[PDB]
Specification:
Largest sheet of chain A: 5 strands, antiparallel
Subunit structure (chain B): Interacts with SPY. Interacts with ADO1 (via N-terminus) and ADO2. Interacts with ADO3 (via N-terminus). Interacts (via N-terminus) with CDF1. Interacts (via N-terminus) with TCP4.
Subcellular location (chain B): Nucleus; Cytoplasm
Bound molecules: flavin mononucleotide
Oligomer: heterodimer
Number of strands of chain A: 5
Shape of chain B: elongated
Radius of gyration of chain A: 13 Å
Number of helices of chain A: 3
Strand content of chain B: under 5%
Organism (chain B): Arabidopsis thaliana
Family (chain B): Belongs to the GIGANTEA family.
Order of helices and strands of chain B: HHHHHHHHHHHHHHHHHHHHHHHHHHHH
Number of domains of chain A: 1
Strand content of chain A: 35-45%
Number of strands of chain B: 0
Strand order of the largest sheet of chain A: 2-1-5-4-3
Distance between the termini of chain B: 119 Å
Radius of gyration of chain B: 35 Å
Structural class of chain B: mainly alpha
Helix content of chain A: 10-25%
Structural class of chain A: alpha+beta
Protein name (chain B): Protein GIGANTEA
Helix content of chain B: over 70%
Shape of chain A: globular
């Protein structure tokens, strides 16, 4: 079961706009708390989440390339999971206006 | 010396059954007792009571003790207090038929009688502070109750006026503890029924001097009392109660409105912890909103209830599952029933309430949606909530980007109403173009549509697509032809939306999603150009 998320890359830090229903039920974070926030927070940082893999995203995010990787993220319950994120830059004219994260949670 | 004398009298043996000898004999001892009244008298009776009590037989000593207090209230202190101390000790258990108390309950059931009665209650109040010697309790709370119970309504009302300080133990403490003992041991609540009018409403005018100089007490401690009274009070009684407080003179209340609102705070607060009595599910509407409107419907009394709604709607915590529906449903109903004239006022009070004051936020409007669902079609009330809507949207436009989440909510949260949300989002978009913000609305649609379109193709997820198609399908239908031009221009200048619609068209996994997706598309085509 994939959870989905979208970011407006035209704003600063790509704030979230959409949250899939399963994301709402497997992160405890209903849409209202996380919209306008970037998803920088799902790992919060916390020392044990791999520092490199997080930096590899932001580098990959600038040029606008697909990134597939796997971090451990935790609900605000503190209970941790890990997913393989797929971040998909979407563009048309062709400027990266939106981002789509397709993350598949696994505790 | 003299205690030792009456030690073998008929004072300690059961009262003669003859009424005439009962009366003649008691008349004789009350004069023997009262002959002394020396410095020693309190010390004298104190030895007499602890030594001679408690016994289980009915004795003539009870009646001499009880009467001497009546004929000499000046010395009620020296008589009751030895008993008070043993009640504190545990020497005496208090039974309403325990025999020192059997008669003091009986003398109370005539101005001489009233004063003696009064002082008995005035004494027992001061010693009634809580002790622990199994919760800690107030030792003399129940005795006050049975005396107050077996008593005319005139003195109960004056006991609570005196006790709460309308004109040593906490005044608020005893009233709560004697009102509970009645509820606790008896199965009714008549003392709390006289106490709540006693605190909120002024003395009766016929009692002039008292009436002129009296003040509303501090209502903070009697927050349970009001809950318990309002939990049981027939709805007609509370509207009698509220109006009386509303149209009281200003010497009574600094601001009666502040106190009427304060009362509401306390029943709401006591609702979370009160046990045994639960307020009705429409308690905010039933005991208040029903009444507050009618005042407007029926001289200057109507004028003061109008100040309450401005007060009620300038502090929007009334809206703060089923209580919200009923609270919201109630607001809708008081609007409809009262008449066109009052609705125009209610609505203009509402506008003056919301800064047209509190700030305006989308979170403020989530409750009014549940009110608006119940409103009828085309009424000025609907217009008023939609007018406050535009006010909210105007204000948010003026960092955290509440707007981005708002549109998500109308589009998909089901907060609810596809009928409303189509109408609501139409307003939302129209405000953004006036002022960028229009990109936000432009941007979210693609994100939601395409993310949900991808999820379906790859139970709740399919349900939301249907809703978004219908909201957009209806945005075409309902500057109604003008927004339609914008959506069609939005869809076919972005290749992502273009693809997502097409796959939805051909989806048979869900019957209604592709009937719907087809229609939206054809609507895009015609309004595209
Ligand atoms: O500054 P930093 O190096 O911390 O940034 C890297 C990321 O942590 C952050 O910038 C986001 O881009 C990462 N991100 C997620 N990070 C997570 O830990 N869990 C997730 O589920 C994430 N989903 C994301 C989805 C999208 C669309 C983006 C753009 C980023 C993202």
């Amino acid at each position: 079961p994939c959870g989905f998320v979208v970011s407006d890359a035209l704003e600063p830090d790509n704030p979230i706009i959409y949250v899939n229903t399963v994301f709402e039920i497997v992160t405890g974070y209903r849409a209202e708390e996380v919209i306008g926030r970037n998803c920088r927070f799902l790992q919060c940082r916390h020392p044990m989440v791999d520092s490199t893999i997080v930096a590899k995203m932001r580098q990959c995010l600038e040029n606008g390339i697909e990134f597939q990787g796997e971090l451990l993220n935790f609900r605000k319950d503190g209970s941790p999971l890990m997913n393989k994120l797929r971040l998909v830059p979407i563009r048309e004219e062709d400027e990266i206006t939106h981002f789509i994260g397709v993350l598949l949670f696994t505790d | 010396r003299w205690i030792d004398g009456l030690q073998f009298s008929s004072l300690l043996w059961p009262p003669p059954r003859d009424p005439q000898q009962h009366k003649d004999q008691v008349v004789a001892y009350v004069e023997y007792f009262g002959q002394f009244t020396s410095e020693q008298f309190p010390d004298d009776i104190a030895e007499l009571v602890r030594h001679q009590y408690p016994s289980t037989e009915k004795r003539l000593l009870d009646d001499v003790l009880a009467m001497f207090v009546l004929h000499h209230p000046e010395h009620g202190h020296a008589v009751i207090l030895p008993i008070i101390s043993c009640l504190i000790d545990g020497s005496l258990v208090y039974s309403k038929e325990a025999h020192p108390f059997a008669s003091f309950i009986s003398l109370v059931c005539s101005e001489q009688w009233a004063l003696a009665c009064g002082e008995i209650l005035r004494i027992l109040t001061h010693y009634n502070r809580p002790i622990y010697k199994r919760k800690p309790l107030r030792p003399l709370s129940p005795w006050i109750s049975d005396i107050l119970l077996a008593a005319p309504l005139g003195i109960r009302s004056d006991y609570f006026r005196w006790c709460s300080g309308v004109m040593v133990a906490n005044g608020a403490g005893v009233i709560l503890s004697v009102c509970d003992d009645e509820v606790a041991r008896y199965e009714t609540a008549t003392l709390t029924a006289v106490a709540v009018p006693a605190l909120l409403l002024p003395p009766p005018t016929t009692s002039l001097d008292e009436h002129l100089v009296a003040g509303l007490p501090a209502l903070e401690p009697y927050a349970r009392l009001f809950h318990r009274y309002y939990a049981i009070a027939t709805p007609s009684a509370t509207q009698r109660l509220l109006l009386g407080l509303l149209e009281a003179p200003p010497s009574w209340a600094p601001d009666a409105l502040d106190a009427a609102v304060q009362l509401v705070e306390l029943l709401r607060a006591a609702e979370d912890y009160a046990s045994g009595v639960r307020l009705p599910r429409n308690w905010m509407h039933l005991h208040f909103l029903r009444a507050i409107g009618i005042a407007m419907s029926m001289g200057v009394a109507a004028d003061a209830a109008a100040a309450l709604l401005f007060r009620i709607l300038s502090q929007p915590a009334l809206l703060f599952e089923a209580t919200i529906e009923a609270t919201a449903q109630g607001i809708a109903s008081m609007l409809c029933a009262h008449g066109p004239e009052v609705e125009w006022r209610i609505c203009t009070i509402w506008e003056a309430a919301y800064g047209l004051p509190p700030i305006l936020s989308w979170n403020l409007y989530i409750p009014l949606l549940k009110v608006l669902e119940y409103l009828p079609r085309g009424s000025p009330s609907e217009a008023c909530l939609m007018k406050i809507f535009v006010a909210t949207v105007e204000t948010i436009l003026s960092a955290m980007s509440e707007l981005r989440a708002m549109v998500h909510a109308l589009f998909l949260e089901s907060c609810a109403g596809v009928e409303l949300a189509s109408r609501l989002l139409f307003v939302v978009l129209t405000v953004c173009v006036s002022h960028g913000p229009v990109a936000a609305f432009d941007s979210y649609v693609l994100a939601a549509v395409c993310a949900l379109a991808c999820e379906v193709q790859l139970d709740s997820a399919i349900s939301h697509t249907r809703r978004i198609l219908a909201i957009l399908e209806a945005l075409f239908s309902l500057a109604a032809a003008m927004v339609a031009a914008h959506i069609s221009e939005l869809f076919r200048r972005s290749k992502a939306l273009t693809h997502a619609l097409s796959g939805l068209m051909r989806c048979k996994w869900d019957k209604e999603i592709h009937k719907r997706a087809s229609s939206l598309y054809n609507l895009i085509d015609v309004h595209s150009k």
